[PDB]
Design a protein around this ligand. Structure first.
Ligand SMILES: O=C(O)[C@@H](O)[C@H](O)[C@H](O)[C@@H](O)CO
Ligand SMILES: [Cl-]
Length: 303
């Protein structure tokens, strides 16, 4: 049999974890045992960035990644989750099957990473902080954690905070030790990581409707048979639809779970938060093609 390790940062029982189990079961079933996934939640194989490195070098790994992270390699991918670019997961899904996207995925393949599935719904990212945040000025001097992603570092800087890059597994002790004052993620990820134990203000900035790729190194992926590849990709499509079902009410459920555990939920000045990123989306990523955000904003509109 062909064993593949699946890596992500989410805790057991979270939507992404349930989706990966769905994917694993389906691949095992369709391949009659020839393809098996072994799941590694909670960053067990290492940090998200570290695992991408292991994959690129040929490890038998499929790992969640991030478009904002992948923009180190193919810059234009980073616009997919650019702040406030679209409120619609469905329109993003369409974008992620467009020729504009295909060409970027083909570019990434030549840099030794392959996107197997591009459009897993991860959820709507919100700030979780020690003190309430309702407008950008409230982030003044606040050390807000971001993952290793150029897109989110620049977004949090534009929003008014002090972006502090760190791996997901270091966030909880970072909050507890006072190294950082908050982070951002979807409710299901904030609840799963128990970050509510050390940061009790959920501020509904809703800055990213986050789409997730799962990727493998081209040097491992290309040495799979075409038949194995197709089983994995066919199954991944069903996994996306299944996860869409999981996430539909899971984000509200987690919102309620957060409140029950003592988190205060703050509405924010959304027009002020959207305004705060107007410069950064236009000229803050000099490596982007000219007018990329507005181009994609508009593509998303034909949908
Ligand atoms: O906060 C984190 O480090 C994770 O929740 C990431 O945002 C997540 O794994 C994404 O990189 C996946 O697309
Ligand atoms: Cl990271």
């Amino acid at each position: 049999e062909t064993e593949i390790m699946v890596a992500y940062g989410n805790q057991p029982g979270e939507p992404i974890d349930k989706a990966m189990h769905f994917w694993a079961d389906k691949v095992k079933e369709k391949s009659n045992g020839d393809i098996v996934f072994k799941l590694f939640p909670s960053s067990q194989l290492g940090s998200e960035t570290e695992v991408l490195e292991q994959a690129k070098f040929g490890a038998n790994i499929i790992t969640i990644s991030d478009y904002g992270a992948l923009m180190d390699i193919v810059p234009d991918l980073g616009v997919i989750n650019a702040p406030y670019i679209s409120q619609s997961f469905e329109k993003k899904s369409k974008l992620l099957h467009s020729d504009w996207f295909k060409d970027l995925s083909d570019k990434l393949d030549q840099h030794d990473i392959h996107i197997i599935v591009p459009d897993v719904i991860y959820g709507t990212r919100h700030l979780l902080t020690k003190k309430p945040v309702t407008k950008p000025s409230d982030l003044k001097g606040m050390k807000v954690r971001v993952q290793h992603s150029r897109l989110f570092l620049q977004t949090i800087n534009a929003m008014g905070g002090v972006p502090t890059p760190m791996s997901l597994s270091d966030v909880y002790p970072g909050l507890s030790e006072g190294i950082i004052d908050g982070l951002e993620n979807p409710t299901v990820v904030l609840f799963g990581g128990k970050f509510f134990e050390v940061a009790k203000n959920l501020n509904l900035t809703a800055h990213t409707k986050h789409m997730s790729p799962f990727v493998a190194g081209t040097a491992f992926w290309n040495n799979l048979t075409p038949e194995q590849q197709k089983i994995i990709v066919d199954a991944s499509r069903e996994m996306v639809t299944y996860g869409g079902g999981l996430i539909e009410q899971a984000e509200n459920e987690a919102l309620e779970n957060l409140k029950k555990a003592g988190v205060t939920v703050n509405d924010v000045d959304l027009p002020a938060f959207e305004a705060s990123v107007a410069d950064v989306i236009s000229t803050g990523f000099p490596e982007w093609s000219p007018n990329l955000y507005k181009n994609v904003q508009e593509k998303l509109s034909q949908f």
